[PDB]
Amino acid sequence: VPHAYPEQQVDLGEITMNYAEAGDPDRPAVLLIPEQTGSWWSYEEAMGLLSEHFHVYAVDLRGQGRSSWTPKRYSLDNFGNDLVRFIALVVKRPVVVAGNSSGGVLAAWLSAYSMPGQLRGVLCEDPPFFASELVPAHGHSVRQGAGPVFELFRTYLGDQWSVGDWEGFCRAAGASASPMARSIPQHLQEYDPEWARVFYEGTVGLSCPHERMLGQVKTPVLLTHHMRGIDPETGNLLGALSDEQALRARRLMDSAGVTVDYESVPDASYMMHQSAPARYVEIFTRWAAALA
Amino acid sequence: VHVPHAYPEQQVDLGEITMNYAEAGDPDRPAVLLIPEQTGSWWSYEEAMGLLSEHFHVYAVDLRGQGRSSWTPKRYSLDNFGNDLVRFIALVVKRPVVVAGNSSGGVLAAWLSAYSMPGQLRGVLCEDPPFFASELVPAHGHSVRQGAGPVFELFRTYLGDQWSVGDWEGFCRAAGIPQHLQEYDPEWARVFYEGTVGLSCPHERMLGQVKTPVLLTHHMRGIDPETGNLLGALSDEQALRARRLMDSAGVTVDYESVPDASYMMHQSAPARYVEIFTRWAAAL
Amino acid sequence: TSPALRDVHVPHAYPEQQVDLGEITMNYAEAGDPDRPAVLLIPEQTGSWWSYEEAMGLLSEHFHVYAVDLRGQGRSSWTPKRYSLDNFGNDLVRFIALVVKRPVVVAGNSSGGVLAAWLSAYSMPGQLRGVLCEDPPFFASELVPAHGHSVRQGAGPVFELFRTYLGDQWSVGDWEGFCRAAGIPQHLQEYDPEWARVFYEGTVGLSCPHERMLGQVKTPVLLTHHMRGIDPETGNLLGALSDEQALRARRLMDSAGVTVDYESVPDASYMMHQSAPARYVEIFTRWAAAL
Amino acid sequence: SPALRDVHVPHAYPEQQVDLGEITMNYAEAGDPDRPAVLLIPEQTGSWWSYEEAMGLLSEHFHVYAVDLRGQGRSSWTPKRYSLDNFGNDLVRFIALVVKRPVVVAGNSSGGVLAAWLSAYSMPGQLRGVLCEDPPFFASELVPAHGHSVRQGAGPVFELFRTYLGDQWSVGDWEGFCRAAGASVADGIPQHLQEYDPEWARVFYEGTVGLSCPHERMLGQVKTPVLLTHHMRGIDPETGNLLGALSDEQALRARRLMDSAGVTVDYESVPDASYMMHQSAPARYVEIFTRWAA
Numbered sequence A: 001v002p003h004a005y006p007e008q009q010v011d012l013g014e015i016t017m018n019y020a021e022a023g024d025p026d027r028p029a030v031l032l033i034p035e036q037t038g039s040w041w042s043y044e045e046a047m048g049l050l051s052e053h054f055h056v057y058a059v060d061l062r063g064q065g066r067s068s069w070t071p072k073r074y075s076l077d078n079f080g081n082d083l084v085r086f087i088a089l090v091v092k093r094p095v096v097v098a099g100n101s102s103g104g105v106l107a108a109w110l111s112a113y114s115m116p117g118q119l120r121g122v123l124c125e126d127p128p129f130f131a132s133e134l135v136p137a138h139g140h141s142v143r144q145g146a147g148p149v150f151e152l153f154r155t156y157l158g159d160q161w162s163v164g165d166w167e168g169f170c171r172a173a174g175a176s177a178s179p180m181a182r183s184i185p186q187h188l189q190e191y192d193p194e195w196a197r198v199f200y201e202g203t204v205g206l207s208c209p210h211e212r213m214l215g216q217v218k219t220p221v222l223l224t225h226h227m228r229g230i231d232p233e234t235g236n237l238l239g240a241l242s243d244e245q246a247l248r249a250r251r252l253m254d255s256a257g258v259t260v261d262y263e264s265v266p267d268a269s270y271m272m273h274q275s276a277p278a279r280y281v282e283i284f285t286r287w288a289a290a291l292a
Numbered sequence B: 001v002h003v004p005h006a007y008p009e010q011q012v013d014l015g016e017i018t019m020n021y022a023e024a025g026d027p028d029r030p031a032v033l034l035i036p037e038q039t040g041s042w043w044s045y046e047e048a049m050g051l052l053s054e055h056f057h058v059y060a061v062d063l064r065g066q067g068r069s070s071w072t073p074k075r076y077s078l079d080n081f082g083n084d085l086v087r088f089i090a091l092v093v094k095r096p097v098v099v100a101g102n103s104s105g106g107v108l109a110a111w112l113s114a115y116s117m118p119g120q121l122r123g124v125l126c127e128d129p130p131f132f133a134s135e136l137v138p139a140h141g142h143s144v145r146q147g148a149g150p151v152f153e154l155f156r157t158y159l160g161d162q163w164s165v166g167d168w169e170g171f172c173r174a175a176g177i178p179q180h181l182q183e184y185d186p187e188w189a190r191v192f193y194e195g196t197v198g199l200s201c202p203h204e205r206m207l208g209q210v211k212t213p214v215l216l217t218h219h220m221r222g223i224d225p226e227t228g229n230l231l232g233a234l235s236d237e238q239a240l241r242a243r244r245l246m247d248s249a250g251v252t253v254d255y256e257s258v259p260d261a262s263y264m265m266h267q268s269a270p271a272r273y274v275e276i277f278t279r280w281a282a283a284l
Numbered sequence C: 001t002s003p004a005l006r007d008v009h010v011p012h013a014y015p016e017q018q019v020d021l022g023e024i025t026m027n028y029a030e031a032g033d034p035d036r037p038a039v040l041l042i043p044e045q046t047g048s049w050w051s052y053e054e055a056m057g058l059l060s061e062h063f064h065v066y067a068v069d070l071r072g073q074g075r076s077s078w079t080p081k082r083y084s085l086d087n088f089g090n091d092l093v094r095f096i097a098l099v100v101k102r103p104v105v106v107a108g109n110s111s112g113g114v115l116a117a118w119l120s121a122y123s124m125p126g127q128l129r130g131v132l133c134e135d136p137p138f139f140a141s142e143l144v145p146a147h148g149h150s151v152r153q154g155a156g157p158v159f160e161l162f163r164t165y166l167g168d169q170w171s172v173g174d175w176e177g178f179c180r181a182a183g184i185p186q187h188l189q190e191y192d193p194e195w196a197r198v199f200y201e202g203t204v205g206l207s208c209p210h211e212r213m214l215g216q217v218k219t220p221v222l223l224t225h226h227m228r229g230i231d232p233e234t235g236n237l238l239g240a241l242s243d244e245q246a247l248r249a250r251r252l253m254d255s256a257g258v259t260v261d262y263e264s265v266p267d268a269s270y271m272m273h274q275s276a277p278a279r280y281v282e283i284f285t286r287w288a289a290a291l
Numbered sequence D: 001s002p003a004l005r006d007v008h009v010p011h012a013y014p015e016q017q018v019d020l021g022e023i024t025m026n027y028a029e030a031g032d033p034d035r036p037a038v039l040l041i042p043e044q045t046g047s048w049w050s051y052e053e054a055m056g057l058l059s060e061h062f063h064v065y066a067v068d069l070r071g072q073g074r075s076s077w078t079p080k081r082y083s084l085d086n087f088g089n090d091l092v093r094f095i096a097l098v099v100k101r102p103v104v105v106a107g108n109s110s111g112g113v114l115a116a117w118l119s120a121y122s123m124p125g126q127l128r129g130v131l132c133e134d135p136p137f138f139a140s141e142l143v144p145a146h147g148h149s150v151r152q153g154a155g156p157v158f159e160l161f162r163t164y165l166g167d168q169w170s171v172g173d174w175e176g177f178c179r180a181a182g183a184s185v186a187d188g189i190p191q192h193l194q195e196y197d198p199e200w201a202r203v204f205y206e207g208t209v210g211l212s213c214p215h216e217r218m219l220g221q222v223k224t225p226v227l228l229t230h231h232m233r234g235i236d237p238e239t240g241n242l243l244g245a246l247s248d249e250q251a252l253r254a255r256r257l258m259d260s261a262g263v264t265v266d267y268e269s270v271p272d273a274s275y276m277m278h279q280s281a282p283a284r285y286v287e288i289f290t291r292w293a294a
Helices: A039-048 A076-091 A104-112 A146-158 A166-174 A192-203 A211-213 A241-253 A277-288 B044-052 B077-094 B104-115 B148-158 B168-174 B185-195 B203-209 B234-248 B269-281 C048-058 C084-098 C110-120 C154-164 C173-179 C192-202 C209-216 C244-255 C277-289 D047-060 D083-098 D112-123 D156-167 D174-181 D199-205 D217-221 D247-259 D284-294
Strands: A006-012 A016-022 A028-034 A056-059 A095-101 A119-125 A221-225 A228-230 A237-239 A261-265 B009-015 B020-024 B031-034 B057-061 B097-102 B120-127 B214-218 B219-224 B229-232 B253-258 C016-020 C027-030 C037-040 C064-068 C102-111 C127-135 C223-227 C229-231 C235-237 C260-264 D015-019 D024-030 D037-041 D063-067 D105-109 D127-133 D226-230 D231-235 D242-244 D265-269
Touching: A006 A076, A016 A039, A016 A076, A028 A039, A028 A076, A028 A104, A039 A056, A039 A277, A056 A076, A056 D174, A076 A095, A076 A104, A076 D083, A095 B253, A104 A119, A104 A211, A119 A277, A146 A166, A146 A192, A211 A241, A221 C027, A228 D199, A241 A261, A261 A277, B009 B044, B009 B077, B009 D174, B020 B044, B020 B077, B031 B077, B031 B104, B044 B057, B044 B269, B044 C037, B057 B077, B077 B097, B077 B104, B077 B120, B097 B104, B104 B120, B104 B203, B120 B269, B148 B168, B203 B234, B214 B234, B234 B253, C016 C084, C027 C048, C027 C084, C037 C048, C037 C084, C037 C110, C048 C064, C048 C277, C064 C084, C084 C102, C084 C110, C102 C110, C110 C127, C110 C209, C110 C223, C127 C277, C154 C173, C154 C192, C209 C244, C223 C244, C223 C277, C244 C260, C260 C277, C277 D024, D015 D083, D024 D047, D024 D083, D037 D047, D037 D083, D037 D112, D047 D063, D047 D284, D063 D083, D083 D105, D083 D112, D083 D156, D105 D112, D112 D127, D127 D284, D156 D174, D156 D199, D217 D247, D226 D284, D247 D265
Parallel strands: A028 A056, A028 A095, A095 A119, A119 A221, A221 A261, B031 B057, B031 B097, B097 B120, B120 B214, B214 B253, C037 C064, C037 C102, C102 C127, C127 C223, C223 C260, D037 D063, D037 D105, D105 D127, D127 D226, D226 D265
Antiparallel strands: A006 A016, A016 A056, A228 A237, B009 B020, B020 B057, B219 B229, C016 C027, C027 C064, C229 C235, D015 D024, D024 D063, D231 D242
16 A cells, blocks of 8 residues: 555665655665564654654565565575665665664664674664574573464465465464464555564574674664563563563673663553654654764 | 493393383382483482382383483484383383483473373372473473573583594583493483474473373572573473473372472482482372 | 364274373274284375275285274374374384284385384384385485485475465365365365474474484385386476385395385385275285285 | 684785675685676685686686685684575675676585575676586585485585584594594695684584575576586485585576576586586686686
8 A cells, every 4th residue: 555655666686675765865864674564664653753854764674565575585684684785775874773673683683794884873672682583592482472473474374475364363363372462454464474484483593693693783772672571371471572681682782892772661562663653753863863 | 331330230122222220129019210310320310229129119221322221313302212111111110100200301201191101100200300491492481502501512512422522621621521421322412402302292282281190399490690591400480380281281290399409319319309209109 | 074173084894993092092993803913004194094994804804904093183183293203103002012912014005104114113022023114205205314305305295285274283274275276085184284294394203214214124024116206397206205215215124134025016006005905905915924 | 723713824816805794704806807807606615715726817807806705714703694695695795895896606516506696696786697616506405495405415524524623613623523534534634624614514414504595496586697517426326325516407407497587597517527626627617617708
């Protein structure tokens, strides 16, 4: 469907990346990475506010939105290298990156693994550090967090919506123990459920353990930690990451020799840029103002 | 590398493997089967067998890949360990048995409780069992990489499958050869570290299907502040979720927390170990 | 038709019995005189005990025949997350020890023949006199075999459709999608499609490499090699196992020290006991009587 | 000691380095910078100077770049990060940052697998065409869509690298490697192997290097002309294992996929050449290259 901004596409080589652009093209460039199942327009309201001071890019990752679906090719390194090419081909200037949930993991990915100087700093909006990994070095695994949702996506929707049993997913999700599962939406119609597979099966980040990535960040990192808790019935993690996982992540990025700003907001939803955009933008603008 | 012991050793052909074991007590007494911990031979129970033999017909066994039992490359799995013990109970014991297992042996004790042949078991004691903690993809709590993983990686890297590397010098640096380790096939550590030993045997299905009374002794455990890793066999969270699953299976789950005992209480504190065993064993 | 509800079973020529093997209940049928040499029949994947229905009537002249439903099939227990060659084989080990209670000659078709070989090498001592592996996918059913085609280049493509469109315990049951990607055959209605997952994902035999199994067989083995070929469009294996895989399986079994009989029937379907029962039972009885 | 990475020696050409972001890539350069650019990707265990002799000849016609991949030579060792996508994207950044011109990519062994990686997955316009010198298409995968798997070919070697050399030479038990190698080298610890991170072998043996990069999808999405040179290959009668880089079946299926992609696929069989023809027969290798490259 159409949205608040016109959409553009760029050939990154393997894929075509769809994205939207806002703000004076001379202002400092900002790159927004949506969450899993989220398209670029997940940031729609935030872009308008950020466009007052920033040149904002919001992108569809591969397997999402209008960007190419790439069966068997979904990995953190392929996601991140797509963004490396986007920065080098479209933006052509240093960027401040803001990523939400899985996008926040990719924001840290770029801070550590981008090409030199591509980034001035990254905002990781409620990122599932460790919690999104099958075998994390610290704390809950994906199977004890969002995994239950990813499983239902894998089984009832299938790669490239090959199954497409929406009713079956809703039933299983309503009977789930995961409140995120209990939580076709437009953003889901544009979503390649093989995303969920690689996360559930542990292949998306097999060659990209978070401990090595976080210990190699090279830019200032603003880490916002939203709602989190423990489910009594299952013991599973609620929210993006646990307090322990945030602690270990911070000590890793601190050891990397960068400035780590930890902004805990335990009463915010995991998509603050959508639920409380003014608060999200103020948090981002204040931190992004002191970078370079 | 094997040395003589205070008990005569016997061997039985289970089919794929030959299992070495030791026997103590009177055949008139209730039969008992002791499963050693990882890297432990049957004579890990030498101290406890003396006391238990007074009122029990005790059997202590070497699992495959340990002691004088067959080393089976590429065959180390919970189901293979457990069915080896099913065959030992059927061929050697030939009566109902109360099982006791330490650490990995404790996981195999819970295995028999759920997956043995009908009527083979009267009850199982899981001595400090790493429920979930020994898995690579546990349903609850720390994974093996956040607990005993680092030690398993050292066995895998410097000792190697069937001691194929045998870099004891490098192992100590990374961390003589203890007797129990000389009789130990380090491919044990690989299958645990790599998550293959229990791939077809997730603990939550195992624990949710136990069919006998279960005594769970939880020994020393904690968290390393520097890494957040698990110390001990399993965490309080994992012990809770294990008991909830076993309780749902419809069995009497007895739980004794001994926070000041080593993981091998039957060797470090045999009298205390036998005391907890005979007490619970007498109520079966 | 709803296989997920397990209300699909139909009557057959022989009465069905059930036994508690501990973890599972195993459904089976029985034919012949108990005083005769016992025979155990293992169906192919997607096949229930009654896959041998006709062959049972013929074999009952000479033998005491047991035909079993493996777990995940027929009326036997469905065990999510538990489907593995070692669990399949130890189910049969217990079936022999609890029900048959006598030495047996085992015949297994397709994956059942892999299990027949499994028993030859990994059963309890004296349980088996010999095994007939009817068109077994030696190596070809493994994700990472030591020889020749992998499962992804054989039955894998079919297993993938079973996994995706039927799903574990028929939880998806998208028969329309399956047909498009490719009513329900009765045998498939009795089939737990998690069978296909563990074969496609290579977890069924991870801890049971066929090379080590075949090299440790301890009974005479008869290996019938039915139709096989190469699909021109993909190069995939047609049939159970290639000639290269059969050759390597024979030398492994020969190295183990057992009497190997290789019976090539290249013009037979993979279910000869069902398509050509007389020929199948002829091959069985001739070989079984010479044990 | 290789674990300390204190093993490197001088070579015929000066060595340069570029920061690619995650890693620093060491490379050597030759030829007139005005001539068409060429990028040489060494084999597994091979450093840029595996092409030393070939560089002298190619430098007469092309602007040649020879690179040390990550985990090899003087480039960064990246524990737990070895994958085809990371190898390939390193080369994408190398072309973008250093060459800044379209390149013809020649790769040997795993390097040839990475050459096809770039043909399909590089940035638009980065490549003119690729030469895959005896590439283990499918044969280097753990779960290939066609033919032998790595466990049936070079797998046994990688297994020995993993067990006796270990990640980052952490084991450094070359003594045991020789023992085990003689029961599964011939010139002492080869210098190229002392510069090599054996975690390379682990990710290939364990099937993680290409878990997210199946060759079927890669070869089916090549976007440049491809020359596939096929050297010695056969079957060991005793074990049925694959000798060489890839079987004729795997070469056929690879060329069918690449043809479906719509590119020009050239296939040259050299059944008498070693897999490192660029090193064992530099003149013969450069003849094949120059003839096709023009």
